[PDB]
Amino acid sequence: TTTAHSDYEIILEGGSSSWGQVKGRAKVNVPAAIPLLPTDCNIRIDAKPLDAQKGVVRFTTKIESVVDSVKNTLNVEVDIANETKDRRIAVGEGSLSVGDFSHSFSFEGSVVNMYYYRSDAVRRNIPNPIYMQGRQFHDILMKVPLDNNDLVDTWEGFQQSISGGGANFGDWIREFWFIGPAFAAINEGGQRISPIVVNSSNVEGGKGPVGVTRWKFSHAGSGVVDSISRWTELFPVEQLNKPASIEGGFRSDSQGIEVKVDGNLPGVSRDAGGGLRRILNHPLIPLVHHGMVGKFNDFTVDTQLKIVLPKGYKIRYAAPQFRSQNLEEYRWSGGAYARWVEHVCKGGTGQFEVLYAQ
Amino acid sequence: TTTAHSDYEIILEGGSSSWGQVKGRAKVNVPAAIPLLPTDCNIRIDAKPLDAQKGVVRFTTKIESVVDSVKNTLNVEVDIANETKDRRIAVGEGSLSVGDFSHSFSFEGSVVNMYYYRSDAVRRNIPNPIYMQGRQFHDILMKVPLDNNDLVDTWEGFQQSISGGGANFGDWIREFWFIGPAFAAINEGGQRISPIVVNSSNVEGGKGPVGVTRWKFSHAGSGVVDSISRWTELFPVEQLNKPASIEGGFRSDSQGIEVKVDGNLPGVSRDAGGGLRRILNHPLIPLVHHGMVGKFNDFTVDTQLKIVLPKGYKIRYAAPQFRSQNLEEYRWSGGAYARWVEHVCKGGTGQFEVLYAQ
Amino acid sequence: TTTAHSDYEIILEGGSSSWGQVKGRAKVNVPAAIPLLPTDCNIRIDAKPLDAQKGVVRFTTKIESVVDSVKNTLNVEVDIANETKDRRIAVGEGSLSVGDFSHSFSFEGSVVNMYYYRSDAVRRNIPNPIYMQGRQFHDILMKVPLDNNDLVDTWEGFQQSISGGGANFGDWIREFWFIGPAFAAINEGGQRISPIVVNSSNVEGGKGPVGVTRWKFSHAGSGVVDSISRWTELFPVEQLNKPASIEGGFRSDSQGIEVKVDGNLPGVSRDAGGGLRRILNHPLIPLVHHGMVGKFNDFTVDTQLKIVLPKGYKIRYAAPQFRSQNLEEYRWSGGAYARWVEHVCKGGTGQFEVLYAQ
Numbered sequence A, B, C: 001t002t003t004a005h006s007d008y009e010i011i012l013e014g015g016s017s018s019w020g021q022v023k024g025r026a027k028v029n030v031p032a033a034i035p036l037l038p039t040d041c042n043i044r045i046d047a048k049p050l051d052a053q054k055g056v057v058r059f060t061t062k063i064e065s066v067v068d069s070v071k072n073t074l075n076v077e078v079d080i081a082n083e084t085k086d087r088r089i090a091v092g093e094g095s096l097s098v099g100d101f102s103h104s105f106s107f108e109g110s111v112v113n114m115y116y117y118r119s120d121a122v123r124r125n126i127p128n129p130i131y132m133q134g135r136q137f138h139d140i141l142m143k144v145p146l147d148n149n150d151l152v153d154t155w156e157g158f159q160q161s162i163s164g165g166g167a168n169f170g171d172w173i174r175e176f177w178f179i180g181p182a183f184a185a186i187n188e189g190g191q192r193i194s195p196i197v198v199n200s201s202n203v204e205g206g207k208g209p210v211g212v213t214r215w216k217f218s219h220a221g222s223g224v225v226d227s228i229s230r231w232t233e234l235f236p237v238e239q240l241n242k243p244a245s246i247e248g249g250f251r252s253d254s255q256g257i258e259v260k261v262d263g264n265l266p267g268v269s270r271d272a273g274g275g276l277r278r279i280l281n282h283p284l285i286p287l288v289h290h291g292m293v294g295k296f297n298d299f300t301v302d303t304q305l306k307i308v309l310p311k312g313y314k315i316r317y318a319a320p321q322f323r324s325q326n327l328e329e330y331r332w333s334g335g336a337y338a339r340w341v342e343h344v345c346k347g348g349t350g351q352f353e354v355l356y357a358q
């Protein structure tokens, strides 16, 4: 049979905390859609508060992949802080490698989230808003040491293209940037990527010569794009009073996919009003984008979810309904929950709400 | 099992009439894709000829919905008339409500449909044309009393945005306008929405102050967009010699969908040439847009269609073929018809033609 | 049951040849998605080297279709040659017919393929690259005798549109050009079509008057578009030391689809490095575009592939693995291969690699 086997667990903190431990595991005997297989990847993301800096988070991520035998890596360390509810700043550094090749980088930037035409008439009438339309402006200064011949060559290639290419450069860069199926995924999610505008390009010297570029773009969304709709929520700095982490890994080939995720992080629950809390609303881009790959083989669901509430708390509402309960432990499987799992794995965004209370 | 149960019925008028009674009912035990559930909605649309006005139709629609407990309404009454085969005019008024908030509006406008590069070489050779490419130009004057503080606030927000925003305003408005999954659906159907151009914005006074805007946009299609391809057909004013109506309602949540539609209206059949008539060609946007939600759960079809021809008329051709017949009554179920139902519910546009004759 | 029955065979040439014989057959009892049925079509494509012209290929194609009873044809004969690895030239002529109407044409043009930002850092590290982003510039001079009244009329319609329409003409032409579902398919594949620019329009005289237009456009891809990513590979002129041909035909209606393809052509295998060869990487646009129709009915796979290697060669790697082997003959069916067939018929691009060696 083609059967998708999966297991998910959430363990929630109580009191004023929004933290939870999250676990997910899945195995399915279908090919992945990658046109190079096997393809394997591990990612780790960490965040900790910085001791001597009020509201600043040290965020790091490490990616390792193997694609048709070729080993790749990316490492990034970044300090991130809000300036206002709309404006966030970042400064960081990192490196990447592909086979025998590597390069490093450093950057700083500002991102301004701008909702379109928000109103109190909406706010006071919609208890759990989902789609929030907006545009999010990036301003980036980046630096790369030109410390091998390929880097020199690519710098020169870009300088000629920018010099010669007027508006075309920043227009046509989008199908370079969003390689492969990434480009189609933009519109799928009601997202838009603006042209790039290059403000300046300079070689400094570092050490050695460094290619320095100041550039800008914006992206927009009609409300599915969670990076815009949930801009403040997705950076839960006030809850980060200790280190948070998540890691995920998958292995895939032309006969199967297997994946594991483990994390401990703020923002797993959220205040729902009225003395209630919910599991955070499911982000929509993961569902819509995974929907672009989840429809290629028929499958049966073999899936269980366990949610462990904080001590003494109880479920107030869940739909699909839990299958069973004992004290803080609630379990879902089969029936309507299994049809919901099938639905979201194929791209559906139907709501599975879980509300609970002290 | 996941089974979709549905039943459809058509009862046709004869002679020179294109009218039919239409009924549809469906129930399916799958979640809807709305990210807020339950979501319920009723719509009623009515059209009647105006006694003292040659070719003018009074068109009304009333929508009531509940989305995550929040009650919404829209009411619109409009007088619509053709000026030429390409140009139609409208004047109307209405109101909307969301929870505790409401506002009213009035408007007038003109819409010009423009096919691209039509030719007699096509006309005389294609017996049943489907894809007709074109662009459809809207010119709108609308008025809203600014009779609560939220309306004042939003007026001021837009005035600043238009003043300050040059071309960006009318560009970026599109992802505000086509909220949520609406934006992606545009391209899915081979449709295009132009930027908005604002011709003027003025507060009048009403009564009290009224926000008045004159603005324009066009939309285009490659031939799937029925609002363009079938522009004259979709407003069957000459057949409307008595009131027409249709109503539909659905209830949905994370475990099921149920829907009912009932109507009596012109345009259910159409002259096919040669002394023949057909059930009107299936519009394609409903199929393509519903295709964006119909692929998220496997289902079995349990579906019957009944078509009742006018007295003495008989089917000349149907594919998929009817299952059974008795006098004017033809029934479809099972076999090829059921595979067609599955197909169109998932987004397929394959032709199911029904031709009949006196 | 809904069952897709299909059979594929590849017979490879050895030595320095990349040629293979290809056969495919399929039958499936589902409706096609065409909104006019039945629809049938045959295509034949032929290529031969020109005796007195070094590197020039005479390429011909003939299409015959019937769509809702209407017979159509297209015939084109073209001489094609590379000037450089990036620039190709063409000169040709042909005719088309629809029912009682026909017209002829002649043309010449140049096409320049331009990859974006290629690098040796990529080249030396990726053994089998797939996604190659780029833009491909067409420059076309075409001539049509205005030798019937419809041609005169359409010429005049276009002259007025171009004269009057500024940038809109070359913008809005895209939804005329990519009729029906073609328009949506562009973005689906990460493809872009630029506006048209018209350089000139003139009536010559021919004979009689001839409408002559010089015009340009580019298309681009993020790497899925094989016409860009595999620009040199897709025109295997150096291997064409004798005539090549392929033919395909299908019949479809609201109850089934049947198709047959037969060809003998260069480029079926390719050097994989290291003394190895592979079956050419599967082109991605056919899979992505067919994916737009392959998801509308559940189906079971009944499918066999046979690959016959050149004498003495053996498979070095295949995933999904072959089912059985005897001497040069390898067969796939069932199991993982059948899940791969289902996957690619629905739009999946997962890699099925076949490597072999002398």
Ligand code: BCL
Binding pocket: A022, A024, A043, A045, A047, A057, A059, A063, A080, A226, A227, A230, A233, A234, A235, A236, A237, A240, A244, A246, A247, A248, A261, A263, A265, A266, A267, A268, A282, A283
């Ligand atoms: C620069 C990146 C941005 C950022 C962008 C986003 C975006 C965008 C989203 C979030 C989302 C979340 N973020 Mg944030 N986030 C940042 C910083 C943080 C910090 C911090 C204090 O620094 C914290 C603690 C969080 C915490 C959170 C949670 C509130 C939420 C995920 C909930 C969950 O259960 O996930 C459980 C996790 C899983 C089930 C799967 C995890 C899979 C792997 C291990 C990680 C994701 C990989 C992703 C699919 C692919 C990345 C591709 C890149 C090319 C590398 N983010 C910075 C500022 N964050 C999501 C959300 O729901 O927001 C409302 C979301 O959509």
Ligand code: BCL
Binding pocket: A008, A009, A010, A022, A023, A024, A025, A041, A042, A043, A063, A248, A249, A250, A259, A260, A261, A279, A280, A281, A282, A283, A286, A287, A290, A305, A341, A344, A345, A352, A354
């Ligand atoms: C294909 C399956 C679906 C999916 C199916 C489900 C199901 C089913 C359930 C949840 C549930 C939850 N999911 Mg979800 N979910 C997906 C993706 C995400 C992402 C994300 C950033 O991608 C986020 C933040 C969330 C967040 C959430 C919470 C709202 C909630 C509780 C956590 C949980 O049980 O996780 C479980 C963990 C997973 C499902 C693992 C998902 C991992 C995804 C696919 C990303 C892997 C990235 C990979 C390792 C690295 C990529 C690197 C790049 C290639 C460079 N999901 C994918 C796309 N999710 C539960 C819920 O609603 O509780 C109320 C629930 O029952």
Ligand code: BCL
Binding pocket: B022, B024, B043, B045, B047, B057, B059, B063, B080, B226, B227, B230, B233, B234, B235, B236, B237, B240, B244, B246, B247, B248, B261, B263, B265, B266, B267, B268, B282, B283
């Ligand atoms: C301002 C709106 C436009 C208009 C736009 C359209 C569009 C667009 C289409 C039609 C279509 C039709 N219209 Mg018209 N139509 C108008 C005025 C009229 C008047 C009239 C004399 O005033 C009449 C009698 C009709 C009659 C008809 C039929 C010829 C045809 C539907 C056939 C059928 O069997 O439906 C049976 C109905 C059903 C199976 C389902 C009905 C569902 C519910 C009850 C109504 C539709 C809701 C829709 C899905 C969502 C609307 C969302 C909005 C945000 C509110 N229209 C005005 C001028 N009409 C369709 C067609 O096929 O044209 C060729 C079509 O695509």
Ligand code: BCL
Binding pocket: B008, B009, B010, B022, B023, B024, B025, B041, B042, B043, B063, B248, B249, B250, B259, B260, B261, B279, B280, B281, B282, B283, B286, B287, B290, B305, B341, B344, B345, B352, B354
């Ligand atoms: C998901 C199912 C498919 C669908 C499946 C079928 C099937 C199967 C058959 C038809 C048939 C017909 N359909 Mg259809 N059809 C759909 C949508 C439409 C729409 C439309 C405006 O949406 C129109 C005008 C038509 C028109 C037609 C006629 C050509 C024909 C005879 C009427 C009939 O039997 O209706 C039956 C009525 C329905 C199927 C109900 C459809 C209601 C749709 C989904 C809209 C509901 C709107 C909701 C109530 C309100 C939305 C409000 C907004 C959220 C604000 N269909 C949807 C998208 N249709 C029959 C035929 O071809 O006869 C020859 C036939 O056998």
Ligand code: BCL
Binding pocket: C022, C024, C043, C045, C047, C057, C059, C063, C080, C226, C227, C230, C233, C234, C235, C236, C237, C240, C244, C246, C247, C248, C261, C263, C265, C266, C267, C268, C282, C283
């Ligand atoms: C003007 C057209 C272009 C061109 C554009 C393309 C494009 C684009 C592609 C190819 C591809 C291929 N081309 Mg080339 N090709 C041209 C000239 C040639 C000549 C020659 C010496 O003149 C030769 C021998 C080839 C040979 C080849 C093969 C290397 C490869 C197909 C492999 C296979 O097994 O197919 C076996 C075939 C089948 C399984 C199915 C065949 C179906 C039918 C009979 C033909 C295709 C119809 C297509 C779906 C629809 C066309 C619609 C039009 C509106 C008419 N091409 C010219 C220069 N060629 C493909 C590839 O993989 O490249 C890497 C590809 O994507």
Ligand code: BCL
Binding pocket: C008, C009, C010, C022, C023, C024, C025, C041, C042, C043, C063, C248, C249, C250, C259, C260, C261, C279, C280, C281, C282, C283, C286, C287, C290, C305, C341, C344, C345, C352, C354
């Ligand atoms: C829906 C089914 C899928 C598909 C499923 C498979 C499967 C399954 C297998 C291959 C395999 C192969 N396919 Mg494939 N393949 C498709 C389309 C293509 C096209 C193309 C130009 O459309 C090309 C060049 C190829 C090329 C290739 C080679 C890489 C490989 C060996 C040839 C073979 O066995 O062909 C077999 C022939 C076919 C599948 C026939 C495909 C015909 C397509 C649908 C086009 C028909 C055009 C029609 C006749 C005319 C249209 C005219 C217009 C309407 C005007 N495929 C379609 C879209 N292909 C085999 C492989 O990977 O070996 C290692 C293998 O096992």
Ligand SMILES: [N+]
Binding pocket: none
């Ligand atoms: N899609």
Ligand code: NA
Binding pocket: A101, A102, A103, A104, A148
């Ligand atoms: Na390096």
Ligand code: NA
Binding pocket: B101, B102, B103, B104, B148
């Ligand atoms: Na009010």
Ligand code: NA
Binding pocket: C101, C102, C103, C104, C148
């Ligand atoms: Na002719």
